[PDB]
């Protein structure tokens, strides 16, 4: 399954989402290498990840190494785990770092564990053609560092063009937060987005942002930045209707 994404060509009977363009996940001159089982594949900026071979509504794990060439030397920028959550009309990636380049000593590596979200893409629902009314309930997954078992629940009131949800069952209690009510605003590319506050007993503990995906607003996908006592923690978000 994971090895097929790195080696097998595109089949159209493969279930969507079939393609996920790696924009923010691989930067212009960098070179991201993904490994799973005995397979491995190299990606550049703008290349497509064969998400069709991956399982829907699950987190897929790849070992990764990020590299760029400076002068005439391949410095290893970053090493760790590359995560992908796949849905029918959306998908998002994340990087669990284990070592990063020593900025002040060329060729050296320093241990440092970060978790960040990479690329949130799919068939963006245009803001102008959203459901003109009604109420849809999205249910899915919230995943952070070393935890892919938190539950996303979100509801969108398309009449009021509002939205609210919460996160539950993450192992870290600071992270199971409420996603406060917020507006559905248009993006610069007219994508339908929702930017709101993270709450935790009705007080500011961060912020979140979701995009609506699918021609019928079937799915939402985004990320939550949650202020904690030990710094910011990034959580991936993805949910779908029934």
Nearer to other proteins, 99 or 197 (CB): 99
- SS3 of 178-211: EEEEEEEEECCCCEEEEEEEEECCCCEEEEEEEE
Q: How far is the CB of 39 from other proteins (least distance, A)?
A: 8
Convert residues 92-121 into a mask of x (bound to other proteins by CB under 8 A) and - (unbound). ------xx-----xxxxx-x-x--------
The interface with other proteins within residues 12-51 (CB under 8 A) comprises 33, 35-38, 40
Nearer to other proteins, 31 or 139 (CB): 31
55, 61, 151, 227: residue in contact with other proteins (rule CB under 8 A): 61
9, 13, 72, 203: residue in contact with other proteins (rule CB under 8 A): 72
Q: How far is the CB of 153 from other proteins (least distance, A)?
A: 29
Nearer to other proteins, 37 or 48 (CB): 37
The CA distance from 85 to 55, in Å, is 8
Q: How far is the CB of 225 from other proteins (least distance, A)?
A: 25
16, 59, 62, 170: residue in contact with other proteins (rule CB under 8 A): 62
Give whole-number Cα distances, 123 to 30, 35, 48, 126, in Å.
26, 27, 15, 9
Task: Note the residue count of the chain.
Answer: 242
The CA distance from 154 to 140, in Å, is 9
Q: How far is the CB of 51 from other proteins (least distance, A)?
A: 17
How many Cα atoms sit within 13 Å of 18 on the Cβ side? 8
Q: What are phi and psi of 180, to 5 degrees?
A: -65, 160
Helix (H) or strand (E) holding 65: strand 59-70
Q: How far is the CB of 100 from other proteins (least distance, A)?
A: 10
Does residue number 147 form part of the binding site for other proteins (CB under 8 A)? Answer: no
Max intra-chain CA distance, the chain? 59
Nearer to other proteins, 13 or 105 (CB): 105
81, 123, 174, 225: residue in contact with other proteins (rule CB under 8 A): 81
Instruction: Read off the tokens for 160.
Output: 């009021």
Q: How far is the CB of 131 from other proteins (least distance, A)?
A: 40
Task: Identify which of 152, 160, 166 has the alpha carbon closest to the alpha carbon of residue 220.
Answer: 152
The CA distance from 140 to 45, in Å, is 29
Catalog residues that contact other proteins under the rule CB under 8 A: 2, 33, 35-38, 40, 61-65, 72-74, 76, 79-81, 98-99, 105-109, 111, 113
């Amino acid at each position: 399954g994971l090895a097929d994404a790195l080696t097998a060509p595109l089949d159209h009977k493969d279930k969507g989402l079939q393609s996920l363009t790696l924009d923010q996940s691989v930067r212009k001159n960098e070179k991201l290498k993904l490994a799973a089982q005995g397979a491995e594949k190299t990606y550049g900026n703008g290349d497509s990840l064969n998400t069709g071979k991956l399982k829907n509504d699950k987190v897929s794990r790849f070992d990764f190494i990020r590299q760029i060439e400076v002068d005439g030397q391949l410095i290893t920028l970053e090493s760790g785990e590359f995560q992908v959550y796949k849905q029918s009309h959306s998908a998002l990636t994340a990087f669990q770092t284990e070592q990063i380049q020593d900025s002040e000593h060329s060729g050296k590596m320093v241990a440092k564990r970060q978790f960040r979200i990479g690329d949130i893409a799919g068939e963006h629902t245009s803001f102008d053609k959203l459901p003109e009314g009604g109420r849809a309930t999205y249910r899915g997954t919230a995943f952070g560092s070393d935890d892919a078992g938190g539950k996303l629940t979100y509801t969108i009131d398309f009449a009021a063009k509002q939205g609210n949800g919460k996160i539950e069952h993450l192992k870290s209690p600071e992270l199971n937060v409420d996603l406060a009510a917020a507006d559905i605003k248009p993006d610069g590319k007219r994508h339908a987005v929702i930017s709101g506050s993270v709450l935790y007993n009705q007080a500011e503990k961060g912020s979140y942002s979701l995009g609506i995906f699918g021609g019928k607003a079937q799915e939402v996908a985004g990320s939550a930045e949650v202020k904690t006592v030990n710094g910011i923690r990034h959580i991936g978000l993805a949910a779908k209707q029934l």
